[PDB]
Short mmCIF file of C-alpha atoms and ligand atoms in Angstrom, two decimals:
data_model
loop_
_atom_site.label_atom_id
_atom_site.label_comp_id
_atom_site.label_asym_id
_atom_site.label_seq_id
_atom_site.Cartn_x
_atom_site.Cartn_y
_atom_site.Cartn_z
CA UNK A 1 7.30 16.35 -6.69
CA UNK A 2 6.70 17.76 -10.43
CA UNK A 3 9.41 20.28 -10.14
CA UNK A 4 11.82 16.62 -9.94
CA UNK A 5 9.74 14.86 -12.76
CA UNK A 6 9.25 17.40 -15.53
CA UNK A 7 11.19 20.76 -17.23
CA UNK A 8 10.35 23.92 -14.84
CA UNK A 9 7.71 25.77 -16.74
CA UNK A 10 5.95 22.65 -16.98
CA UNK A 11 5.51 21.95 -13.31
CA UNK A 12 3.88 25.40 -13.15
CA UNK A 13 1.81 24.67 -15.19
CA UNK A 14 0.91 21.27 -14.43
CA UNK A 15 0.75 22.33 -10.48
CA UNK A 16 -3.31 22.07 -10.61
CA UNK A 17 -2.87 18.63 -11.70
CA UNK A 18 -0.22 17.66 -9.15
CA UNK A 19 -1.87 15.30 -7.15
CA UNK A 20 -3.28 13.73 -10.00
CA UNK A 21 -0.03 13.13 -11.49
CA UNK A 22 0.89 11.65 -7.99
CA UNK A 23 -2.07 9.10 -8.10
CA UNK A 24 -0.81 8.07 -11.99
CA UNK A 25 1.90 6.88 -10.54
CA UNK A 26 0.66 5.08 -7.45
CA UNK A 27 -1.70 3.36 -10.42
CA UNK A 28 1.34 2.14 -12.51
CA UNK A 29 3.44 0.44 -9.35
CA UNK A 30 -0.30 -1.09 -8.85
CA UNK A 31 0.01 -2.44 -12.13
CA UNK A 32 3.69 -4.14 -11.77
CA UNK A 33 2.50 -5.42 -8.42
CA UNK A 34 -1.15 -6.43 -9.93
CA UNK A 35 1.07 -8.53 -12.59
CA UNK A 36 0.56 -6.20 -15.56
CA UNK A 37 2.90 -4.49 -17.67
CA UNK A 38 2.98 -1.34 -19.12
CA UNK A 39 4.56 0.98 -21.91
CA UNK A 40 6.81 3.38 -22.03
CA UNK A 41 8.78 2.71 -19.59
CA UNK A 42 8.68 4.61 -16.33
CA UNK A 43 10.95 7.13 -17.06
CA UNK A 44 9.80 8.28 -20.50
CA UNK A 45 6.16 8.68 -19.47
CA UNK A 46 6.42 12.11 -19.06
CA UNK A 47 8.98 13.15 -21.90
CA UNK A 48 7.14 15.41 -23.30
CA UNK A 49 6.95 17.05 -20.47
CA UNK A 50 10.54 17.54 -19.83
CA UNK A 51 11.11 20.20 -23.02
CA UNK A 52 10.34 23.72 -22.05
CA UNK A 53 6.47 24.80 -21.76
CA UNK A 54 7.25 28.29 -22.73
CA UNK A 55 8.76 27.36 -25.64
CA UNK A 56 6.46 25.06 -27.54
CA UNK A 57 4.75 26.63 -30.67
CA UNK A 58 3.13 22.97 -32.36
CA UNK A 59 0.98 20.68 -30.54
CA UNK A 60 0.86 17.62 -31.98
CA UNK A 61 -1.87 15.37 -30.20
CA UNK A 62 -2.33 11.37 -29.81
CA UNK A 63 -4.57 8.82 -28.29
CA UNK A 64 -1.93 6.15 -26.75
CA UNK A 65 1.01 4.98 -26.97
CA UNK A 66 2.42 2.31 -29.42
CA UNK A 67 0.81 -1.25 -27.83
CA UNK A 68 3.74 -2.79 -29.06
CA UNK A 69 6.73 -3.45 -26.83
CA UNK A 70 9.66 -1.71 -28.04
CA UNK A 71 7.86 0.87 -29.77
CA UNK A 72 6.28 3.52 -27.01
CA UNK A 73 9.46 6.26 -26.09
CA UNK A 74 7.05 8.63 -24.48
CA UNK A 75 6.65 11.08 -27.72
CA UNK A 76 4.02 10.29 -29.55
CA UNK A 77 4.22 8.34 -32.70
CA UNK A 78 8.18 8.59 -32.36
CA UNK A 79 9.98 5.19 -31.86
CA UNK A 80 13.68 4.46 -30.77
CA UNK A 81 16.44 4.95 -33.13
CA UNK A 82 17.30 1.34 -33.73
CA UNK A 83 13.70 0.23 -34.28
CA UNK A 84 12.56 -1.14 -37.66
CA UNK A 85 10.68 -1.62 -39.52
CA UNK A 86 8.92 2.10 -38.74
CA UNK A 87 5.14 1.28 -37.24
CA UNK A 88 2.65 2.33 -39.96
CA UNK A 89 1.32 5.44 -38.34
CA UNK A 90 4.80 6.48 -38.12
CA UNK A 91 5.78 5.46 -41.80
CA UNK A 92 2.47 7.28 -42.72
CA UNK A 93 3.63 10.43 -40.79
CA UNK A 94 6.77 10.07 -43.20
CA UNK A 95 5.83 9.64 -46.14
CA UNK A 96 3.35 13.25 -45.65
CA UNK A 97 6.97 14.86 -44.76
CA UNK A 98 8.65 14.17 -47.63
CA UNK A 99 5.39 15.15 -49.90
CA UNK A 100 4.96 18.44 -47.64
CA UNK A 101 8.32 19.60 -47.46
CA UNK A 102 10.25 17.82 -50.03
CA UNK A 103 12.82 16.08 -47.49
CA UNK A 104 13.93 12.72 -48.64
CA UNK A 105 13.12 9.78 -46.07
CA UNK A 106 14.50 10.20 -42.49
CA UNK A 107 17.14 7.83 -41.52
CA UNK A 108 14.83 6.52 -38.71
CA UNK A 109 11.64 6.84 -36.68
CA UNK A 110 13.76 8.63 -34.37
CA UNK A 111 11.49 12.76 -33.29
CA UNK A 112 13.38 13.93 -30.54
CA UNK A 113 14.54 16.83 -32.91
CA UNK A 114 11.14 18.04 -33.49
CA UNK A 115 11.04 17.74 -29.59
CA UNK A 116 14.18 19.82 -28.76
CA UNK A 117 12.26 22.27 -31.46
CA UNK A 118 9.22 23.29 -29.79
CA UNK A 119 6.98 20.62 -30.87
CA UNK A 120 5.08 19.00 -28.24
CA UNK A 121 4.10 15.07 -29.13
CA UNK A 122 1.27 14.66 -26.71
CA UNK A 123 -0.71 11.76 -26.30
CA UNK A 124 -3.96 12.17 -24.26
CA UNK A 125 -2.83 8.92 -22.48
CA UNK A 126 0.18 8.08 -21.10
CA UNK A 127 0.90 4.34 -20.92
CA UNK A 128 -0.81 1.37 -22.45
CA UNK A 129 -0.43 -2.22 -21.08
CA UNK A 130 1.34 -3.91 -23.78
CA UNK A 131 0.23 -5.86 -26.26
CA UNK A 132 -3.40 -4.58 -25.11
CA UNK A 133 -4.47 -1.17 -27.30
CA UNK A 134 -6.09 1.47 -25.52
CA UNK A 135 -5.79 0.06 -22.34
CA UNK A 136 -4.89 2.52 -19.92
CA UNK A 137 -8.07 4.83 -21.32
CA UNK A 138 -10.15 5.99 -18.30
CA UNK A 139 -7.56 5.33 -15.70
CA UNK A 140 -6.78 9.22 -15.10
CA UNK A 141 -4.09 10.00 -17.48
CA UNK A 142 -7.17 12.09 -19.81
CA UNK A 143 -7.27 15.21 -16.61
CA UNK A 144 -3.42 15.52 -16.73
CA UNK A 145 -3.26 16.30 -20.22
CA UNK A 146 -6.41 18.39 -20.36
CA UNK A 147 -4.70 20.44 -18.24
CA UNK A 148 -1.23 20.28 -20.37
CA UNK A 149 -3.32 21.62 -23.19
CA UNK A 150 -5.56 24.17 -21.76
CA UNK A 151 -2.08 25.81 -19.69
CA UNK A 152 -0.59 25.59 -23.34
CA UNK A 153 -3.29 27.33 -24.55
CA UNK A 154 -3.82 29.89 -21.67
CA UNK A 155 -0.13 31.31 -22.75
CA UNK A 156 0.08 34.36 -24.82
CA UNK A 157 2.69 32.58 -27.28
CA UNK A 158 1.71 31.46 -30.56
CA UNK A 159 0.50 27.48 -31.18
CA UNK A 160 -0.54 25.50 -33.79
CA UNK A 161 -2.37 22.32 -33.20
CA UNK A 162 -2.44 19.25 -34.90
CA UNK A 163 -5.16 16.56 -34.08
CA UNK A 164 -3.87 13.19 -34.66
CA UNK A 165 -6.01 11.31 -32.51
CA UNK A 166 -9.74 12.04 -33.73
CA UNK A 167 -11.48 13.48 -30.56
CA UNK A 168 -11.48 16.78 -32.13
CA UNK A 169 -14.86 17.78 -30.60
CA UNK A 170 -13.27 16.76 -27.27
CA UNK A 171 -9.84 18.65 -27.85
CA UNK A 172 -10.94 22.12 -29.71
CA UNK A 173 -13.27 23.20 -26.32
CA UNK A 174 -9.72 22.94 -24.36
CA UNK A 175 -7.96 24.78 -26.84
CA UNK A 176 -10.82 27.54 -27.00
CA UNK A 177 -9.64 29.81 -24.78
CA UNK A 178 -6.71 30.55 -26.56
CA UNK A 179 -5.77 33.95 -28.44
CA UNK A 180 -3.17 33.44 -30.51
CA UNK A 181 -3.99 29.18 -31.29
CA UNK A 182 -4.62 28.17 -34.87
CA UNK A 183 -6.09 24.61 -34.84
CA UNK A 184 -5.43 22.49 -38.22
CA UNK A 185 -8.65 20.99 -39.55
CA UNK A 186 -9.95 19.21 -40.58
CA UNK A 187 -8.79 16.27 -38.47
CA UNK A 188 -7.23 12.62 -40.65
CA UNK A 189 -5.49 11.20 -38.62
CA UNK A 190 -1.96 9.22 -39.97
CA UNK A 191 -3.65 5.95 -40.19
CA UNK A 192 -6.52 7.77 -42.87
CA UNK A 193 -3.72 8.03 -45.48
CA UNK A 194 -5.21 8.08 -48.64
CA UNK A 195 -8.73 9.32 -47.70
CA UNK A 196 -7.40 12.47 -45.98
CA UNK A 197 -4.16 12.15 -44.38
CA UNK A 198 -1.85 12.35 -47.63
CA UNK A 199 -2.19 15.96 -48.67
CA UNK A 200 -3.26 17.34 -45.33
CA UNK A 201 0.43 19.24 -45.52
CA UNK A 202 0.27 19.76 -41.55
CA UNK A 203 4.17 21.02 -41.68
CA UNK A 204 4.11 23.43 -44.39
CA UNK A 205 0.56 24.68 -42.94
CA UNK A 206 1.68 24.89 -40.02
CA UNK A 207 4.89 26.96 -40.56
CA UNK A 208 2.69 29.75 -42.82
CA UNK A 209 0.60 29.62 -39.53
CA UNK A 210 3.20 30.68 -37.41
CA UNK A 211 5.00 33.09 -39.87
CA UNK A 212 1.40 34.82 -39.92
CA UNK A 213 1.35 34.75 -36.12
CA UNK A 214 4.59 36.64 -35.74
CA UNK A 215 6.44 33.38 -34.71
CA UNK A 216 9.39 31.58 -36.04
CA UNK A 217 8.52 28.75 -37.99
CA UNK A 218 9.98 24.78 -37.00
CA UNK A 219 12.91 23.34 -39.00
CA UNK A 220 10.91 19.98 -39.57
CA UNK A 221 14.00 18.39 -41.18
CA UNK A 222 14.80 15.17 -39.59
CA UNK A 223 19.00 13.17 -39.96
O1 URA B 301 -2.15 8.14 -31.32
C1 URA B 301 -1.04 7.54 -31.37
C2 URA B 301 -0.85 6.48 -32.25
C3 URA B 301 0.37 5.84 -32.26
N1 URA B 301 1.34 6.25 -31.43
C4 URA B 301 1.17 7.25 -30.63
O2 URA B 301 2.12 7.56 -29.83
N2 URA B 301 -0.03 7.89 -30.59
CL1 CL B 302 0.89 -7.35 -19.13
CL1 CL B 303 0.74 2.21 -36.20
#
């Protein structure tokens, strides 16, 4: 059951979605026993999921996961501490923090911090087959996390959201509802860089966002 899978606020509210999440994961043994393979592995699928709901003040949305093995940890764009090189998007991401905030390079691709910190690193599907881009689109992972995002933005905290996966005109009507969201735009994603990404200052932004919504802001600094 969700209340097993995923921190306790988030199996509230994810309840509406419950089944849902129980048919994701008949479709992934389907996929072991079908021959296929697929990314992150089983038990980070739902990280994000398993830091508090209540307590998330950035939303930082993705497409998919990483297609390549090794990469995917279940937070997007993150990667495990002993990859390298960093994956562009991620070295992208970087290279904005240390403009933005003045931070010298992190030691490694490594964002559970900003995890552990209220910062939710959604993607808007799960798992990927590896190897094999966008290839768990459609397959019902895009309901789950609509509902993620419109409970998130159903709360009476303060959020800011960060689109990192295009589909803005499909992700602002979800966080609409919302009183007390500020949504980022306009919308470069990491892999933009130079025609939109560098500059975009989405950490600094969002920190004089949530100072101006009464909120603490997020210590972006990374080890
Ligand atoms: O959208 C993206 C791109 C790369 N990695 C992610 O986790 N999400
Ligand atoms: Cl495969
Ligand atoms: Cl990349």
């Amino acid at each position: 059951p969700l209340s097993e899978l995923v921190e306790r606020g988030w199996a509230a509210a994810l309840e509406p979605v419950a089944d849902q999440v129980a048919h994701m994961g008949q479709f992934l043994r389907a996929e072991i026993a079908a021959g296929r393979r697929y990314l992150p592995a089983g038990s980070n699928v739902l990280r994000a999921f398993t830091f508090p709901f209540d307590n998330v003040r950035v939303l930082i949305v993705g497409q998919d996961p990483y297609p390549t093995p090794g990469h995917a940890v279940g937070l997007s764009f993150s990667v495990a501490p002993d990859v390298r090189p960093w994956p562009r998007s991620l070295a992208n991401i970087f290279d904005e923090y240390t403009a933005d905030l003045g931070y010298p390079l992190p030691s490694n691709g490594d964002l559970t911090p900003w995890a552990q910190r209220g910062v939710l690193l959604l993607n808007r599907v799960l798992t990927v087959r590896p190897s094999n881009p966008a290839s768990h689109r459609g397959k019902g992972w895009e309901a789950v996390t609509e509902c993620a995002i419109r409970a998130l933005a159903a709360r009476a905290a303060p959020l800011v959201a960060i689109l990192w996966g295009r589909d803005a005109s499909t992700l602002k009507p979800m966080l609409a509802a919302g009183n007390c969201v500020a949504i980022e735009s306009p919308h470069p994603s990491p892999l933009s860089a130079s025609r939109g990404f560098f500059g975009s200052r989405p950490f600094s932004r969002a920190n004089e966002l949530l100072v101006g919504m009464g909120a603490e802001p997020i210590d972006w600094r990374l080890p």
